[PDB]
Amino acid sequence: ESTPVLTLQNRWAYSARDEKLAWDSAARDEKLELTEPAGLIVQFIGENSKHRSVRAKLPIPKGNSGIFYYEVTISGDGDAIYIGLATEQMPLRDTHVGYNEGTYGYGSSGKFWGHEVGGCSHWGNERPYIDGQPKFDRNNIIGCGVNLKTRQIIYTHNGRPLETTGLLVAESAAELYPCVSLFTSGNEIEANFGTKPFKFNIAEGI
Template sequence: MDKQMKKEQQQMLFFKLKQNCWDVKFCQNELEITGDDGLTVVNKQKHSTGWRTVFAEQPIPSEDHSSGIFYFEIGVEHMESDGGVLIGFASKQKPFLSVLYRIGTYAYQNNDSFYINGYLRYYPSDNKFYREDIVGCGVNLATRQIIFTKNGRRLDVSNSLVSSFAVPLFPFISLCGFGDKIVANFGPKFLLPDI
């Protein structure tokens, strides 16, 4: 199959979706969603510690998991030295505590940690990310393979599969440091490697 045609077929999924944004109903109080498009998130917590989480309004599409790639990315606009940024997919639940270690959580943390189905995994690499980096998270719907990217480069997280699509999975981010700020890109144009 022609490479361009294959890429267009994979991206068809992006065009079926209404533009996604962060969900104010599933956003912890210390985070602020800014901008008219609902894509920018800033951590406003000054004195407390710990992760603060926001989920996207729309989940990974549930109508067809036989083909295509679901993907989103964030630009890290600001991150304190003691801060932290986490990007991934998880089920939408309250309370928000412990999203990292929940079954059904798939995430990439700025310190080069990966959470696959609620378990912390390390891969031999140096994939830390910082301010001004663009970090992505996706899933190949046919193979269930989780995809993480940094600045357009696909990271090697082999054997990292979504265990089930029975429970809807939503894009989410978590921020740890005061002033940490990200801007989301839910498509359709990405700094996406050829996957």
């Protein structure tokens, strides 16, 4: 459980089906720009601000061994952002990770989403959230991951691990993919899947 299971060659990517339905809608103004061939930097280039999500190419490892983990550095305004793990079915518009069902997320507003634990707050579809978590803005380095053995979700803020005791990811047959949801124009992020050193020391943390 303490050995990291890296998806080093993982990158932000819309799938063939995501692009199919994304170009089924004739609106271009609703897209994020990807800094290829790296595809680790994403920029919200829309005029009007709305929830827009992008997912990684590869899903999480499905083993009972080691840790899945990635980090995201925030540039731009850094506000109205949600980082976490989404299903492939998750809409990339008008929803954020964690808000969407079967997904779990950490919001810039300071909320963990999708974690039904005793004493949590219920939102819209009585969607379980846990409020009062650290907010994040520009220049912060946020980690999201899952201990594959205990199934406990892992969040880190600028390399500091956060309270996630009892926050489990469901062991479904469906694959979960790294996902980030931006809102405001000018928001920029850069993803770290292990290509650069993590600020959270996995070796000295798990």
